[PDB]
Write an enzyme that holds these catalytic residues in place. Structure first.
Site, PDB file in Angstrom:
ATOM      1  N   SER A 121      61.663 -63.389 122.434  1.00 51.25           N
ATOM      2  CA  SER A 121      61.751 -62.615 123.673  1.00 51.25           C
ATOM      3  C   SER A 121      63.182 -62.380 124.179  1.00 51.25           C
ATOM      4  O   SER A 121      63.873 -63.311 124.568  1.00 51.25           O
ATOM      5  CB  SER A 121      60.921 -63.315 124.758  1.00 51.25           C
ATOM      6  N   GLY A 122      63.613 -61.124 124.196  1.00 51.72           N
ATOM      7  CA  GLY A 122      64.921 -60.784 124.726  1.00 51.72           C
ATOM      8  C   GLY A 122      64.886 -60.837 126.238  1.00 51.72           C
ATOM      9  O   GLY A 122      64.491 -59.869 126.899  1.00 51.72           O
ATOM     10  N   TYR A 129      60.989 -54.154 123.020  1.00 47.72           N
ATOM     11  CA  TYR A 129      60.484 -53.637 121.743  1.00 47.72           C
ATOM     12  C   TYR A 129      59.033 -53.115 121.815  1.00 47.72           C
ATOM     13  O   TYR A 129      58.095 -53.901 121.955  1.00 47.72           O
ATOM     14  CB  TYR A 129      60.618 -54.749 120.696  1.00 47.72           C
ATOM     15  N   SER A 174      59.958 -59.701 125.192  1.00 43.70           N
ATOM     16  CA  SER A 174      61.219 -59.421 125.870  1.00 43.70           C
ATOM     17  C   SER A 174      60.988 -59.004 127.316  1.00 43.70           C
ATOM     18  O   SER A 174      59.952 -58.429 127.646  1.00 43.70           O
ATOM     19  CB  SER A 174      62.005 -58.320 125.151  1.00 43.70           C
ATOM     20  N   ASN A 210      57.697 -57.127 128.782  1.00 43.16           N
ATOM     21  CA  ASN A 210      57.174 -56.983 127.430  1.00 43.16           C
ATOM     22  C   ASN A 210      57.089 -58.332 126.722  1.00 43.16           C
ATOM     23  O   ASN A 210      57.348 -58.424 125.531  1.00 43.16           O
ATOM     24  CB  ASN A 210      58.074 -56.031 126.635  1.00 43.16           C
TER      25      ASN A 210
END
Ligand code: CA
Ligand code: CA
Lengths: 355, 354, 354, 355
Positions: A265-266, A129, A227, A201
């Site tokens: 966080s993905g 993101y 992520s 990220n």
């Protein structure tokens, strides 16, 4: 320039020639970078593509597997990887609101080569993101950008930092984005190569650790704008269930840099192997032989692959930080970590080159 | 008589809701956009179906949810956060395999105006089946306007079945396939909850077809043939994320009873969401609330009745899709609707009686 | 006695192997130890069933394997390494819920003499269902000696069904339950492989029973009632670990067709193993061999016939258990065998014909 | 005595009173240690038990979840934890070949209290492999040993190192075994406690990391004789799916000490939460109300629990090593890491006391 060039050595293994995922022969990487200043409509995003083969992925499937440390993210193409462990397309990284456009662009890209073959194209697209620095609601990534990344996809050195899908990303409250690394096993260990490409990220400042040293704790003073998707590749002949095992070792690499503890966080990991080839391409209605001969790495040889993947991911993330530069966009400012500032912080907490 | 039950064919032992549709779960809405255009091998026979899980914006009132995959030869978006945190925060959409991305990003765009500086990343749930035989699936003919038409058409009450919306070009048991729905209501002593199912049926070989258990497929082999299934289960029971996963897997049971679940090529992907808890916090990163939320949980000695209900709803939903399906000729292929009178004849032939 | 197929009842469309049992997969062996002892509330109605995946020692010739859990309300040992690496390295055993540990550790002991300084940790696969109504399950009457008796009795050929071994005190659809087995053989053009199933059936409510799809449970509610299912699938197809997982989940399909899969209380746990690859390395930590092993993989355009066969084998195995079940009165509870003539009457009442 | 008492701080968090899993109120731990020299039939093993509640677990179930980093190990009772997330028994640690005897002993222990309630007892038992120092084929652990561990179960300080199930265990080629630690969140974060209890039996010498510092790399010279189960507890009101998330954070703590890269290592994690009580006890045939009111930690509060669990696991592992002493058995010799030797290794790689 890169982490290792600063005399900072991550883990104990030995990198391949490019120290990149492209050290896995045939693997190709391309970026398309969007940077356009326009107030709250500024574009700081893009797309990164990974070609798993020298040629078309559809014609030479790779065994693959996924692991999810924290599924606060979106992805396409993962269900058939879970089910049958077959990567049959390129892999792409982009921002959260552009995944669909990128995915369907990858589908359209296979249309011409579909010579009446019956199959449904299921590309793997993953995301992080960039909503702070990028106009993420603007959905500025298009098929043309996917085509530019595809056309630029090549072997050799891979650009890092704020490029392609990593353009507007932020890591440990410094500039984030694309990072890559590799490890080569010794001949007595199978001689296989393991590479990783990350789009980093994630993470809070104080938690940053480099080669294990708590560098984040002495970097709190630096201004903050406030992520992670991982692909692991190897030329080892890994079966689908072994690719799953390998993918989870991305947790180990990420944890050692200071990640894996955020709800937001993905953290989504993919691993594919090129060691088995000549796997049957999907063409429904058209039947071949009952079985295919494939090879499997014996489990007493797989630990050296786990170690290598963990190291490759750890260094790939630190490489992303090292390649990161200052970015001001949409009223937010993020600083690149800074090569000298990293070396200073490492010294301050007791690290030294060549101990 | 138009639907399965109207023909005197009863599936399972339970009692359907008023519409015998997923909309019997209060607040749940369904909308279709149906695309039909003749143009040789570029003919368009496809579309999109949307499910609204709430009376209003899904973002503002999340639902607990879960997924189960019987056979993952299919594509979907939005499922990883459902697995991780069990939160449905968007509409659900059905379309064809090569239109998933366009539909998904259209659903993202639809929430843009309402976002109003709230910090979150939109992750819509989009699932698919393959209409490559009747539809120009390489043509990618579904667009954001079609998604907006389906959204505006979303409604309570009866749900159109067969070759409509995402089911427009689908084929099931070598008959016309597509959209099917059904519901079950539990008795008051069992909690009084409603369970609904909406399927997009595109799976199966002829001989395997079973209706109310009867092997009707075995006596329908003679009918000409032109030669995946996504399931959403909804309930107003207050199910937690892990309970929705359990509920989602009972779609295996319903599907198995009609003759599905044994094809390598079939994307059999199931989603279940629950509306019983309606006080869940909308996602807004950076903006912190209270430490906890009080929620409701169905006790495990009451969940079996929900399992039965879901399995029956899914079974009848598939048979409903078939019963509603009509003849279609497209791109050099012809498929027959099962046919109401023909189904009854086949049923009687293998010993079934009303 | 007469089995399901001998009554003219045909399940599915496939062709059974010679014994119509899991032992039709060459090399696979089955042995029972049956404890049946009347002693008021301390009555013993239980036992242990063992499956040998190979003609010789399982440790020396590992099998690729996988698991699927439809409903995890049950206990099992040895499954984590099956999930992780897909290697079955021991026999498989069935018993009652409170004897799993003694049975597991007895299987460990059984490999001690043959260990001969080989470095590994033994992880036997043991599964269970609950015979607490007819059996004094708190008495924990199963011992290592019973495990050795089952092991010594393990052989190819016909497998006894019903109230024997682990199935001795079991109840299915409120009739006598227990052990059932069946097989299917694929045609030569489909690879010629055999798929076999062995179940310990202890699940289900009366009204839900379906035989060959026909709703016989609905016309058997009047019959008195006394008021989990573990499934092993074997095949000589050369399936990889991820493929065995896919095969194992098709036990959900077979179970669903008989009327199972909708109970919170039912430990519905499935294991599938394949013998097609037979050159796999035995575990010996510290002693390393060559970098890789060449193996065979079934291609995915050939795996559907295996899915079908497994589902049919599981379905017929469950009905076989019911058909072999006889009347049992124990600890103040009475359960009736389904009854061969009673089943035929029930089938004909709802339209079935031989 | 323990790691923190040496001036060594793991992470940024604050431990509870005992710095042990027992800092979660009501949770109890008991050991039974078997130590007997007898040539190749020497016994160096035992059993550790965790009571999740002040009273009987059956009467007050806990929400729970599992994560498996590497399933090269055996366990009982996990399938219902996966399915319904309900812990209804004590938890026990022992050696690989004693799992069954320990499990059926735990079933037998509930017999008197069953009193006509209809249920099937499914105790959670986990293991690691002590085959080198212990006669593991001898199966020397019995029901009586389980009863001793149960009776010894209590709140307060928890003995670490070669005790109970950790008696014959080996970690990073030093003496391994039982370790525990805890973290307390601020009132700002809900004030919850997160505790961890590990049985550490994994790892190669070279990879050992303490507070990030690569001490293993300067400890290769020390003589070598040549799995890890983790339970996380918290009084936060976590639902089953949230317990699964919490359990996977053991991967992070384990990774930070240098684990997670061995094929041979049974790395199996369990998390249970005590925040929700009054959960319905299993009694089939006897039905209650349709629903139960429960509490859920909001996801914007769960990250601090993630961080806390990772830190507790990391410190718990190092606590095990620090508590380990020299052991000679069955032709094998293993050295305890040594508190002074550790402080020396830390200075050698740049660590210094006083932050
Ligand atoms: Ca595999
Ligand atoms: Ca939950």
């Amino acid at each position: 320039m890169r982490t290792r060039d600063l005399g900072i050595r991550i883990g104990l293994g030995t990198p391949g020639r490019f120290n990149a995922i492209t050290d896995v022969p045939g693997v190709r990487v391309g970026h398309c970078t969007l940077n356009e200043e326009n107030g709250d409509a500024s574009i700081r995003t893009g797309v990164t593509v990974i070609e798993p083969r020298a040629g078309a992925a559809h014609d030479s499937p790779c065994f693959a597997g996924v692991h999810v440390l924290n599924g606060n993210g979106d992805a396409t193409g993962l269900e058939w990887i879970r089910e049958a462990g077959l990567l049959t397309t390129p892999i792409a990284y982009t921002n959260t609101h552009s995944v669909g456009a990128v995915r369907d662009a990858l589908v359209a890209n296979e249309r011409e080569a579909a010579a009446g073959r019956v199959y449904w194209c299921m590309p793997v697209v993953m995301e992080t993101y960039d909503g702070l620095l990028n106009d993420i609601w603007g959905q500025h990534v298009s098929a043309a950008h996917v085509q530019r990344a595809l056309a630029a996809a090549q072997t050799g050195p891979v650009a890092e930092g704020g490029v392609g899908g990593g353009t507007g990303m932020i890591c440990h409250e410094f500039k984030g984005g694309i990072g890559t690394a590799s490890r080569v096993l010794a001949a007595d260990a199978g001689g296989w190569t393991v590479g990783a490409l990350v789009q980093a990220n994630y993470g809070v400042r104080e938690m940053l650790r480099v080669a294990g040293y708590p560098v984040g704790e002495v970097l709190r003073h630096v201004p903050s704008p406030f992520s992670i998707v991982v692909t692991i590749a190897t030329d080892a002949p890994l079966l689908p269930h072994q690719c799953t095992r390998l993918a989870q070792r991305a947790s180990v690499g990420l944890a050692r840099v200071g990640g894996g503890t955020e709800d937001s966080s993905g953290d989504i990991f993919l691993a594919f192997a090129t060691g088995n080839d000549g796997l049957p391409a999907a063409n429904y209605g058209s039947k071949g032989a009952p079985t295919t001969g494939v090879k499997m790495v014996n489990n007493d040889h797989i630990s050296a692959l786990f170690v290598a993947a963990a190291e490759a991911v750890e260094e790939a993330i630190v490489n992303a930080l090292v390649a990161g530069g200052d970015v001001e966009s949409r009223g937010a400012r993020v600083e690149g970590l800074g090569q000298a500032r990293l070396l200073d912080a490492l010294r301050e907490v007791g690290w030294r080159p060549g101990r």
